[PDB]
Every structure is written in structure tokens, then in C-alpha cells.
Amino acid sequence: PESPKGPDILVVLLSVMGAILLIGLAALLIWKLLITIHDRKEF
């Protein structure tokens, strides 16, 4: 009916928001790995 999903904005916004959170978390994780490697590489 007029809106099988209609406001995909909710889905898309959620998807958009979710994708960004994943990217944000992933980037943070990489930064952590860089410090871990440098911190680990002490010896």
C-alpha cells in the first residue's frame, strides 16, 4: 500500500547511522592497534 516501507528514511537513516557507527568504531579500533603495535614494539 502507499508505504510498503514508505519512510525508508527510518530504515535508511538507521542504516546510514549504523554504517557510520561501524566506521567510527572500526577507525577507532585501528588507531588502538597502531598504539598497541608501537606500545608492544617497545622490545
Binding site: 514508505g6 528514511i9 535508511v12 537513516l13 546510514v16 547511522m17 567510527g24 577507532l28
Partner: protein, 42 residues
């Protein structure tokens, strides 16, 4: 074909994208204030 109408998630997507960018900034800013990403090097 009636211009002014329906939902164009483009604006809302930018809003979500803009807001998402802000979220990342807050986490980075918070950790930086902890000196977690800051180290004293020679």
C-alpha cells in the same frame, strides 16, 4: 513530476551523515582528553 512532494531521504541522509560525523568527533575528543592517544616521545 509534481516537484514539491513526497520524501526525498537526501536531506535526512545528510542530516544523519552530519550527525554521525559529530558522534565520531565526540568519541575522539573524549579519548584525547584522557591522553590515551597522547604520549610523550623524544
Amino acid at each position: 513530476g509534481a516537484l514539491e512532494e513526497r520524501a526525498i531521504p537526501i536531506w535526512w541522509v545528510l542530516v544523519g551523515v552530519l550527525g554521525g560525523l559529530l558522534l565520531l568527533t565526540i568519541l575522539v575528543l573524549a579519548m584525547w582528553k584522557v591522553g590515551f592517544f597522547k604520549r610523550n616521545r623524544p
